[PDB]
Amino acid sequence: TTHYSVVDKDGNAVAVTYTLNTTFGTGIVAGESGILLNNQMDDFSAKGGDANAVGPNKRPLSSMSPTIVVKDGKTWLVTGSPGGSRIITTVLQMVVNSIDYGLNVAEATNAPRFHHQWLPDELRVEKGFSPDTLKLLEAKGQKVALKEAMGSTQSIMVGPDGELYGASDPRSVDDLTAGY
Amino acid sequence: APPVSYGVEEDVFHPVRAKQGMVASVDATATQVGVDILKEGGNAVDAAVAVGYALAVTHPQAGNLGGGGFMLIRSKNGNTTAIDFREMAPAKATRDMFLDDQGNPDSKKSLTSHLASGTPGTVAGFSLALDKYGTMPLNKVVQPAFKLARDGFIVNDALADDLKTYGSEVLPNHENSKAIFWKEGEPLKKGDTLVQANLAKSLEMIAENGPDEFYKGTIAEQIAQEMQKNGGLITKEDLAAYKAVERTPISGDYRGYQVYSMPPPSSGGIHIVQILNILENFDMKKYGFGSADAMQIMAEAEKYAYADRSEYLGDPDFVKVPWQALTNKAYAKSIADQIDINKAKPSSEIRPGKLAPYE
Ligand SMILES: [Sm+3]
């Protein structure tokens, strides 16, 4: 899965998140088309409940969340990210970091992330949080679990004056945010 | 809500700054393709589609023509809309198509066999967007990707590492896939040049004949044959019946800011709004980033949202999603009242919420 954002000189904005599901998907190319085929059928409930069950012509549920935040009536933050169910909390943190903590788009992007998806019952964290903070969380009853980096945000913040501010996730080597 | 910050020289991390247009993506080459499209006079949608096609060549890991995704579009005039181009299960798909003999799911079948594929929507989604909200002809936004496929590009660290790590598990197990991504018995390495002649042909035909090439033409034939000869389900009818769908975005208000995101079949949009609704009852700014209290509150709010997600979400065309109740602020408040900043509630004691009083 991968996400990209775009903002033009007129102030139009687009956020796109698309995928093959897993990396390279099935790894199967369609004959001599040179086109890799997705393995999206795995995103259906194999056996959640019946809501996301495999059915003909049905679209499997996805966590992909291209998102746009508006401030003072104007497009202000354009973001999104890959990461399966972690997409929800990654995008959530981009929004909270920007609105509540007043972080610029790069600061918000480079900040460490945490995540809790109910089951497993564990507060998953990236490297970067204070040992003192983590101990407090455990004292609160949280089961802290240090794991792999989460997501790949590609975002653009728009100033009311038209100035554009962007940031590519450090978690993805070779990525890039550029403009003119 | 405190004052915002676009960035000052004294910060540790600095955003990239631009006065006219901007593109942010996982790949340098694709980003540059988008920027060139904007410089040439294209609008955000035009550039987005060009980037989407470029990534399908330079980022085979996820960029694609054989997959699907979502797009959020907001015009300078305020009109905000969502494009759903998620894959559709084949017509011959069945509820237990992935169960072995014992009745247990066979991951191998839903991940590596020809049965794991849904009908691709990317090409349809991009054309729906380009035709209605773009300003350039498809051949113009596809050309950059076409050249990259035909003339090739240098394999960087990202592609090299991904081919080696994830590619090794599936690509070499298919002759046509191996012929493209493998070299001298090993995955392509950084510095190697990746030329994709067959993909270039597909791109050239799409640019020339439009999306029908993929859904009703040669490419369609190629996908069907691949399936028919290897126990796959995607047929030419499935491809001819595919349709990208423009849907109303899911939205909410957080401290005066309006948030717009993907609606079902996506689960993210609804729950991002729901969680924000919950967090709005707290003075997050006060606790601050990286504080145990801020993390406790958000961790707890997330539990409830994910619980609801496991129960009420699905393809809106097949199941009725209680989005109104899930994004209702009274409901969020009832959840916020259950959060103890000093003591977490075990997930075992948390169940999908009762939405009746909010519908
Ligand atoms: Sm998935």
Coordinates of C-alpha atoms and ligand atoms in Angstrom, one line a residue:
Chain A
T1 CA 0.0 0.0 0.0
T2 CA 1.2 3.6 -0.7
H3 CA -0.1 7.1 -0.3
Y4 CA 0.6 10.3 -2.1
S5 CA -0.8 13.9 -1.8
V6 CA -1.0 16.7 -4.3
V7 CA -1.9 20.4 -4.2
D8 CA -1.8 22.7 -7.2
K9 CA -1.4 26.5 -7.6
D10 CA -5.2 27.1 -7.7
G11 CA -5.6 25.4 -4.3
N12 CA -7.1 22.1 -5.6
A13 CA -6.0 19.1 -3.6
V14 CA -5.9 15.3 -4.0
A15 CA -5.0 12.5 -1.6
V16 CA -4.7 9.0 -3.0
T17 CA -4.0 5.7 -1.2
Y18 CA -3.8 2.6 -3.4
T19 CA -2.4 -0.9 -3.2
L20 CA -2.0 -4.5 -4.3
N21 CA -2.6 -5.4 -0.6
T22 CA 0.7 -7.1 0.4
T23 CA 4.1 -6.1 -1.1
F24 CA 4.0 -7.0 -4.8
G25 CA 0.6 -8.6 -4.1
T26 CA 0.5 -12.2 -5.3
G27 CA 3.7 -11.7 -7.2
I28 CA 1.7 -12.9 -10.3
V29 CA 2.0 -10.9 -13.5
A30 CA -1.0 -11.1 -15.9
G31 CA 0.5 -12.9 -18.9
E32 CA 2.5 -10.6 -21.1
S33 CA 0.9 -7.5 -19.7
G34 CA 3.7 -6.8 -17.3
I35 CA 1.0 -6.1 -14.7
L36 CA 1.3 -7.5 -11.2
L37 CA -2.0 -8.9 -9.7
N38 CA -3.3 -8.0 -6.2
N39 CA -4.2 -10.4 -3.4
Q40 CA -7.0 -8.2 -2.1
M41 CA -9.2 -11.3 -1.5
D42 CA -7.3 -11.9 1.7
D43 CA -8.7 -8.7 3.1
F44 CA -12.1 -10.3 3.3
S45 CA -13.1 -12.1 6.6
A46 CA -11.8 -15.6 6.0
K47 CA -14.3 -17.3 8.4
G48 CA -14.7 -9.4 11.8
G49 CA -18.2 -10.8 11.4
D50 CA -20.4 -11.6 8.4
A51 CA -20.3 -8.0 7.3
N52 CA -16.9 -8.3 5.7
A53 CA -17.4 -11.9 4.5
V54 CA -16.3 -13.0 1.0
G55 CA -19.1 -12.5 -1.5
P56 CA -19.4 -12.1 -5.3
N57 CA -18.9 -8.6 -6.6
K58 CA -18.3 -7.4 -3.0
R59 CA -15.5 -5.0 -2.1
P60 CA -13.4 -6.1 0.9
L61 CA -13.2 -3.6 3.7
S62 CA -10.1 -1.4 3.8
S63 CA -8.4 0.9 6.4
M64 CA -7.0 3.2 3.7
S65 CA -7.9 6.7 4.7
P66 CA -6.8 9.5 2.4
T67 CA -7.7 12.6 4.5
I68 CA -8.2 16.3 4.1
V69 CA -8.5 18.8 7.0
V70 CA -10.1 22.2 6.6
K71 CA -9.3 25.3 8.6
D72 CA -11.1 28.7 8.4
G73 CA -13.0 27.3 5.4
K74 CA -9.8 26.4 3.4
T75 CA -8.0 23.2 2.7
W76 CA -5.3 23.1 5.3
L77 CA -3.9 19.6 5.7
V78 CA -3.8 16.8 3.1
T79 CA -2.5 13.5 4.3
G80 CA -2.8 9.7 4.3
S81 CA -0.7 6.6 4.7
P82 CA -0.3 2.8 4.2
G83 CA -0.2 0.4 7.2
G84 CA -3.3 -1.7 7.3
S85 CA -5.3 -1.1 10.4
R86 CA -2.6 1.1 11.7
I87 CA -3.5 3.6 9.0
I88 CA -6.4 4.9 11.3
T89 CA -4.1 5.8 14.2
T90 CA -1.2 7.0 11.9
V91 CA -3.5 9.6 10.2
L92 CA -5.1 10.3 13.6
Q93 CA -1.7 11.2 15.0
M94 CA -1.0 13.5 12.0
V95 CA -4.2 15.4 12.7
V96 CA -3.8 15.6 16.5
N97 CA -0.1 16.6 16.2
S98 CA -1.1 19.4 13.8
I99 CA -4.2 20.7 15.6
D100 CA -3.6 20.0 19.3
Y101 CA 0.2 20.1 19.5
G102 CA 0.7 22.9 17.0
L103 CA 3.5 20.9 15.2
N104 CA 4.5 21.9 11.7
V105 CA 3.9 19.2 9.0
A106 CA 7.5 17.9 9.2
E107 CA 7.6 17.8 13.0
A108 CA 4.3 15.9 13.0
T109 CA 5.6 13.5 10.4
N110 CA 8.9 12.8 12.2
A111 CA 7.3 12.3 15.6
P112 CA 7.1 8.8 17.0
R113 CA 3.8 6.9 16.8
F114 CA 1.8 4.6 19.1
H115 CA -1.2 2.4 18.4
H116 CA -3.8 0.3 20.1
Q117 CA -6.3 -1.7 18.0
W118 CA -8.3 -3.3 20.9
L119 CA -7.1 -6.8 20.0
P120 CA -4.4 -7.7 20.7
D121 CA -4.7 -5.8 23.9
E122 CA -1.4 -4.0 23.7
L123 CA -0.3 -0.4 23.4
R124 CA 2.1 -0.7 20.4
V125 CA 4.9 1.9 20.3
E126 CA 7.7 2.9 18.0
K127 CA 11.1 3.8 19.3
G128 CA 11.2 7.4 20.6
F129 CA 9.0 7.6 23.7
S130 CA 10.5 8.3 27.1
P131 CA 11.3 5.3 29.3
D132 CA 9.7 7.3 32.1
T133 CA 6.5 7.7 30.1
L134 CA 6.4 4.1 29.1
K135 CA 6.6 3.0 32.8
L136 CA 3.8 5.4 33.7
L137 CA 1.7 3.8 30.9
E138 CA 2.4 0.3 32.3
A139 CA 1.5 1.5 35.8
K140 CA -1.8 2.6 34.3
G141 CA -2.4 -0.9 33.0
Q142 CA -1.3 -0.6 29.4
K143 CA 0.8 -3.4 27.9
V144 CA 3.5 -1.6 26.1
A145 CA 4.9 -3.4 23.0
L146 CA 7.9 -2.0 21.2
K147 CA 7.5 -2.9 17.5
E148 CA 8.4 -2.1 13.9
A149 CA 8.0 1.4 12.5
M150 CA 4.5 2.3 11.4
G151 CA 3.3 4.0 8.2
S152 CA 4.6 6.3 5.4
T153 CA 2.8 9.6 5.6
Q154 CA 3.2 12.0 2.6
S155 CA 1.6 15.3 3.5
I156 CA 1.0 18.9 2.6
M157 CA -0.1 21.7 4.8
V158 CA -1.6 24.7 3.1
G159 CA -1.1 28.2 4.5
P160 CA -4.1 30.6 4.1
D161 CA -1.8 32.7 1.9
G162 CA -1.2 29.8 -0.5
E163 CA 2.3 28.9 0.8
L164 CA 2.7 25.1 0.7
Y165 CA 4.5 23.1 3.3
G166 CA 5.2 19.4 2.8
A167 CA 6.9 16.4 4.4
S168 CA 7.7 12.9 3.4
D169 CA 8.0 10.1 6.1
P170 CA 11.6 9.4 7.1
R171 CA 10.4 5.8 7.5
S172 CA 10.5 5.3 3.7
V173 CA 13.9 5.5 2.0
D174 CA 13.9 7.2 -1.4
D175 CA 10.6 9.1 -0.9
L176 CA 10.2 12.8 -1.7
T177 CA 8.1 15.9 -1.3
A178 CA 8.8 18.6 -3.9
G179 CA 7.2 21.6 -5.4
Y180 CA 7.8 24.8 -7.3
Chain B
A1 CA -7.4 24.5 20.1
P2 CA -4.0 26.4 20.3
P3 CA -2.5 28.4 17.4
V4 CA -1.1 26.4 14.4
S5 CA 2.5 26.3 13.2
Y6 CA 3.6 26.0 9.6
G7 CA 7.3 26.0 10.7
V8 CA 10.0 28.3 11.9
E9 CA 13.8 28.2 11.4
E10 CA 14.4 27.2 15.0
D11 CA 12.5 23.9 14.7
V12 CA 14.4 20.5 14.4
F13 CA 12.4 19.3 11.4
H14 CA 11.7 21.6 8.5
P15 CA 8.9 21.2 5.9
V16 CA 9.7 21.5 2.2
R17 CA 8.4 24.9 1.1
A18 CA 6.8 25.9 -2.3
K19 CA 4.8 28.9 -3.5
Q20 CA 2.8 27.3 -6.3
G21 CA 2.4 23.5 -6.4
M22 CA 3.5 20.4 -4.4
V23 CA 3.6 16.7 -4.5
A24 CA 4.4 14.2 -1.7
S25 CA 5.0 10.5 -2.5
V26 CA 6.9 7.4 -1.6
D27 CA 9.1 7.7 -4.7
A28 CA 11.4 10.5 -5.9
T29 CA 10.9 9.8 -9.6
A30 CA 7.1 9.7 -9.3
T31 CA 7.0 12.9 -7.2
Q32 CA 9.0 14.6 -9.9
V33 CA 6.6 13.4 -12.6
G34 CA 3.8 15.0 -10.6
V35 CA 5.7 18.2 -10.3
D36 CA 6.4 18.3 -14.0
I37 CA 2.7 17.8 -14.8
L38 CA 1.8 20.7 -12.5
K39 CA 4.5 22.9 -14.1
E40 CA 3.0 22.0 -17.5
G41 CA -0.3 23.5 -16.4
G42 CA -2.1 20.4 -15.1
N43 CA -4.4 20.6 -12.0
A44 CA -4.1 18.5 -8.9
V45 CA -6.2 15.7 -10.4
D46 CA -4.1 15.6 -13.5
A47 CA -0.9 15.3 -11.5
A48 CA -2.4 12.8 -9.1
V49 CA -3.2 10.5 -12.0
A50 CA 0.2 10.9 -13.6
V51 CA 1.8 10.1 -10.2
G52 CA -0.5 7.1 -9.9
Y53 CA 0.7 5.7 -13.3
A54 CA 4.3 6.6 -12.6
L55 CA 4.3 4.7 -9.3
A56 CA 2.8 1.7 -11.1
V57 CA 6.1 1.5 -12.9
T58 CA 8.6 2.7 -10.3
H59 CA 7.0 1.3 -7.2
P60 CA 5.7 -2.2 -8.2
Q61 CA 5.6 -2.9 -4.4
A62 CA 2.3 -1.0 -4.2
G63 CA 2.0 1.4 -7.1
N64 CA -0.2 -0.5 -9.6
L65 CA -2.5 -1.1 -12.5
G66 CA -3.5 -4.5 -11.2
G67 CA -4.8 -3.4 -7.8
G68 CA -7.1 -0.8 -6.3
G69 CA -7.5 2.1 -3.9
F70 CA -9.2 5.3 -2.8
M71 CA -9.0 9.0 -3.7
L72 CA -10.2 12.1 -1.9
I73 CA -10.6 15.2 -4.0
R74 CA -11.3 18.7 -2.7
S75 CA -11.7 21.5 -5.3
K76 CA -10.6 25.0 -4.6
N77 CA -14.3 25.8 -4.5
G78 CA -14.9 23.6 -1.5
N79 CA -16.5 20.6 -3.3
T80 CA -15.2 17.5 -1.5
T81 CA -15.8 14.0 -3.0
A82 CA -14.4 10.5 -2.7
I83 CA -13.6 8.0 -5.5
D84 CA -14.0 4.3 -4.6
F85 CA -11.9 2.1 -6.9
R86 CA -11.4 -0.8 -4.5
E87 CA -11.2 -4.2 -6.2
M88 CA -14.5 -6.2 -6.5
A89 CA -14.6 -10.0 -5.7
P90 CA -15.2 -12.0 -8.9
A91 CA -18.7 -13.1 -9.8
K92 CA -17.8 -16.7 -9.1
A93 CA -16.4 -15.9 -5.7
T94 CA -17.9 -17.9 -2.8
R95 CA -18.0 -17.5 1.0
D96 CA -15.9 -20.6 1.7
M97 CA -13.6 -20.4 -1.4
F98 CA -10.6 -20.2 1.0
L99 CA -11.3 -23.0 3.4
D100 CA -9.3 -26.3 3.2
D101 CA -10.9 -29.7 3.9
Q102 CA -10.9 -29.3 7.7
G103 CA -12.8 -26.1 7.3
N104 CA -9.9 -23.8 8.3
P105 CA -8.8 -20.8 6.1
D106 CA -5.9 -21.5 3.8
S107 CA -3.8 -18.3 3.8
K108 CA -1.7 -19.6 1.0
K109 CA -4.7 -19.6 -1.3
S110 CA -5.9 -16.1 -0.4
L111 CA -2.4 -14.6 -0.7
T112 CA -0.3 -16.4 -3.3
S113 CA -2.6 -18.4 -5.6
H114 CA -4.6 -17.0 -8.6
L115 CA -7.7 -17.1 -6.4
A116 CA -6.4 -14.2 -4.2
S117 CA -7.1 -11.6 -6.8
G118 CA -10.0 -9.2 -6.9
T119 CA -11.0 -7.4 -10.1
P120 CA -8.6 -4.4 -10.5
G121 CA -10.0 -0.9 -10.1
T122 CA -7.1 1.5 -10.3
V123 CA -7.4 2.2 -14.1
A124 CA -11.1 2.8 -13.8
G125 CA -10.8 5.0 -10.7
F126 CA -8.1 7.2 -12.3
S127 CA -10.2 7.7 -15.5
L128 CA -13.3 8.5 -13.6
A129 CA -11.4 11.2 -11.7
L130 CA -9.5 12.5 -14.7
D131 CA -12.5 12.7 -17.0
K132 CA -14.7 14.5 -14.4
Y133 CA -12.2 16.6 -12.4
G134 CA -9.1 16.7 -14.5
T135 CA -8.1 18.8 -17.6
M136 CA -5.6 16.7 -19.5
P137 CA -6.2 13.8 -21.8
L138 CA -5.2 10.4 -20.4
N139 CA -2.4 9.9 -22.9
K140 CA -0.7 13.0 -21.6
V141 CA -0.7 11.9 -17.9
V142 CA 0.3 8.3 -18.9
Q143 CA 3.3 9.3 -21.1
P144 CA 5.7 9.8 -18.2
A145 CA 5.0 6.3 -16.9
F146 CA 5.2 4.9 -20.4
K147 CA 8.7 6.2 -20.9
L148 CA 9.9 5.0 -17.5
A149 CA 8.6 1.5 -18.4
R150 CA 10.0 1.5 -22.0
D151 CA 13.4 3.1 -21.3
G152 CA 13.7 1.8 -17.8
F153 CA 15.0 3.4 -14.6
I154 CA 17.7 2.8 -12.0
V155 CA 16.9 0.5 -9.1
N156 CA 17.3 2.4 -5.8
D157 CA 17.7 1.2 -2.2
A158 CA 14.0 0.9 -1.6
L159 CA 13.1 -1.2 -4.6
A160 CA 16.3 -3.3 -4.2
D161 CA 15.6 -4.0 -0.5
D162 CA 11.9 -4.8 -1.2
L163 CA 12.6 -7.1 -4.1
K164 CA 15.1 -9.0 -1.9
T165 CA 12.9 -9.2 1.2
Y166 CA 9.3 -9.4 0.0
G167 CA 9.9 -10.2 -3.7
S168 CA 11.8 -13.4 -3.0
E169 CA 8.7 -14.9 -1.6
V170 CA 6.5 -14.7 -4.7
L171 CA 8.1 -13.2 -7.9
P172 CA 10.6 -16.0 -8.7
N173 CA 7.8 -18.5 -8.4
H174 CA 6.2 -17.3 -11.7
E175 CA 8.0 -17.4 -15.0
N176 CA 6.7 -14.1 -16.4
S177 CA 7.2 -12.3 -13.1
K178 CA 10.7 -13.7 -12.7
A179 CA 11.6 -12.7 -16.2
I180 CA 11.0 -9.1 -15.3
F181 CA 12.2 -8.6 -11.7
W182 CA 14.9 -11.2 -11.4
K183 CA 18.4 -11.2 -13.0
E184 CA 21.1 -13.8 -13.1
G185 CA 19.2 -15.8 -10.6
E186 CA 18.9 -13.0 -8.0
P187 CA 16.5 -10.1 -7.5
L188 CA 17.6 -6.9 -9.3
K189 CA 20.1 -5.0 -7.1
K190 CA 20.6 -1.3 -6.5
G191 CA 22.2 0.3 -9.6
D192 CA 20.7 -2.2 -12.0
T193 CA 18.3 -0.9 -14.7
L194 CA 14.7 -2.1 -14.7
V195 CA 13.0 -2.1 -18.1
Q196 CA 9.4 -3.3 -18.3
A197 CA 8.6 -3.7 -22.0
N198 CA 5.3 -5.5 -21.5
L199 CA 4.1 -2.9 -19.0
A200 CA 5.1 -0.2 -21.5
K201 CA 2.9 -1.9 -24.1
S202 CA 0.0 -2.0 -21.7
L203 CA 0.5 1.7 -20.8
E204 CA 0.8 2.6 -24.5
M205 CA -2.5 0.9 -25.3
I206 CA -4.3 2.5 -22.4
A207 CA -3.0 5.9 -23.4
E208 CA -4.2 5.2 -27.0
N209 CA -7.6 3.5 -26.4
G210 CA -8.5 4.7 -22.9
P211 CA -9.6 2.6 -19.9
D212 CA -11.5 0.1 -22.0
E213 CA -8.2 -1.3 -23.1
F214 CA -7.8 -2.6 -19.5
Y215 CA -11.4 -3.6 -18.9
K216 CA -12.5 -4.8 -22.4
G217 CA -9.4 -5.0 -24.6
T218 CA -6.1 -6.7 -24.9
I219 CA -5.1 -6.3 -21.2
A220 CA -8.5 -7.7 -20.2
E221 CA -7.9 -10.7 -22.4
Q222 CA -4.4 -11.1 -20.9
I223 CA -5.9 -11.1 -17.3
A224 CA -8.6 -13.5 -18.2
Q225 CA -6.3 -16.0 -19.9
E226 CA -3.9 -15.9 -17.0
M227 CA -6.8 -16.7 -14.7
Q228 CA -8.5 -19.3 -16.9
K229 CA -5.2 -21.2 -17.3
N230 CA -4.2 -21.2 -13.7
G231 CA -7.5 -21.7 -11.7
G232 CA -8.3 -18.1 -11.3
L233 CA -11.8 -16.6 -11.2
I234 CA -11.5 -13.2 -12.8
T235 CA -13.3 -13.4 -16.2
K236 CA -13.9 -10.9 -19.0
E237 CA -17.4 -10.3 -17.6
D238 CA -16.0 -9.4 -14.2
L239 CA -13.7 -6.9 -15.8
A240 CA -16.4 -5.6 -18.1
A241 CA -18.7 -5.2 -15.1
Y242 CA -16.2 -3.4 -12.9
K243 CA -17.1 0.2 -12.0
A244 CA -15.3 2.8 -9.8
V245 CA -17.7 4.6 -7.6
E246 CA -17.9 8.2 -6.5
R247 CA -19.1 8.4 -2.9
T248 CA -19.9 11.0 -0.3
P249 CA -17.0 11.5 2.1
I250 CA -17.3 10.8 5.7
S251 CA -16.7 14.0 7.7
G252 CA -16.7 15.5 11.2
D253 CA -15.7 18.6 13.1
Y254 CA -12.8 18.6 15.6
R255 CA -12.4 21.9 17.5
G256 CA -13.6 24.0 14.6
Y257 CA -11.7 22.1 11.9
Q258 CA -13.6 20.0 9.5
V259 CA -12.1 16.6 8.7
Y260 CA -12.9 14.8 5.4
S261 CA -12.0 11.1 4.9
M262 CA -12.9 7.9 3.0
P263 CA -16.4 6.4 3.6
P264 CA -17.2 2.7 3.6
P265 CA -15.9 0.3 2.1
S266 CA -13.1 2.1 4.0
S267 CA -13.2 1.7 7.8
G268 CA -10.6 4.4 8.5
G269 CA -12.6 7.5 7.7
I270 CA -15.5 6.7 10.1
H271 CA -13.2 5.8 13.0
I272 CA -10.8 8.7 12.5
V273 CA -13.9 10.9 12.9
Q274 CA -15.2 8.8 15.8
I275 CA -11.9 8.9 17.7
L276 CA -11.5 12.6 17.1
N277 CA -15.1 13.1 18.5
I278 CA -14.0 11.2 21.6
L279 CA -10.7 13.1 22.0
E280 CA -12.5 16.5 21.6
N281 CA -13.8 16.0 25.2
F282 CA -10.3 16.2 26.5
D283 CA -7.8 19.1 26.6
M284 CA -5.1 17.3 24.6
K285 CA -3.1 20.4 24.2
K286 CA -2.7 20.5 28.0
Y287 CA -1.2 17.0 28.2
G288 CA 1.1 17.4 25.3
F289 CA 2.8 15.1 22.8
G290 CA 4.6 12.1 24.3
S291 CA 2.9 12.4 27.7
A292 CA 1.6 9.3 29.4
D293 CA -1.8 11.0 29.9
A294 CA -2.3 11.9 26.2
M295 CA -1.2 8.4 25.2
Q296 CA -3.5 6.8 27.8
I297 CA -6.5 8.8 26.6
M298 CA -5.9 8.1 22.9
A299 CA -5.1 4.4 23.5
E300 CA -8.4 4.0 25.4
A301 CA -10.4 5.9 22.8
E302 CA -8.9 3.7 20.1
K303 CA -10.0 0.5 21.9
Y304 CA -13.6 1.4 21.7
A305 CA -13.4 2.5 18.1
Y306 CA -11.7 -0.7 16.9
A307 CA -14.2 -2.7 18.8
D308 CA -17.0 -1.0 16.9
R309 CA -15.0 -1.5 13.7
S310 CA -15.0 -5.3 14.1
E311 CA -18.8 -5.3 14.2
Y312 CA -20.4 -2.6 12.0
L313 CA -18.2 -2.1 9.0
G314 CA -18.6 -3.5 5.5
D315 CA -19.2 -2.8 1.8
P316 CA -22.1 -0.2 1.9
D317 CA -23.6 -1.7 -1.3
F318 CA -24.1 -5.0 0.6
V319 CA -24.4 -4.0 4.3
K320 CA -26.0 -1.0 6.0
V321 CA -23.4 0.8 8.0
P322 CA -24.6 2.8 11.1
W323 CA -22.2 5.7 10.2
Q324 CA -24.6 8.3 11.7
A325 CA -24.4 6.6 15.1
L326 CA -20.7 5.9 14.9
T327 CA -19.9 9.6 14.2
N328 CA -22.5 10.9 16.6
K329 CA -20.9 13.2 19.3
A330 CA -23.3 12.1 22.0
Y331 CA -22.1 8.6 21.5
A332 CA -18.5 9.7 21.6
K333 CA -19.2 11.5 24.8
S334 CA -20.6 8.3 26.4
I335 CA -17.3 6.7 25.4
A336 CA -15.2 9.6 26.7
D337 CA -16.9 9.3 30.1
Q338 CA -15.6 5.7 30.4
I339 CA -12.0 6.7 30.0
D340 CA -9.9 6.7 33.2
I341 CA -6.7 8.6 32.8
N342 CA -5.1 6.7 35.6
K343 CA -6.3 3.2 34.8
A344 CA -6.8 1.3 31.5
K345 CA -9.9 -0.9 30.9
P346 CA -8.9 -4.3 29.6
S347 CA -10.0 -5.0 26.0
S348 CA -11.7 -8.1 27.4
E349 CA -14.2 -5.8 29.1
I350 CA -14.8 -3.8 25.9
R351 CA -17.4 -4.8 23.3
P352 CA -18.9 -3.1 20.3
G353 CA -21.1 -0.2 21.6
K354 CA -24.9 -0.2 21.7
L355 CA -25.9 2.3 19.0
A356 CA -29.7 2.2 19.4
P357 CA -29.9 5.4 21.4
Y358 CA -28.0 7.3 18.7
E359 CA -29.9 6.3 15.5
Ligands
SM1 SM -4.6 -5.4 3.6

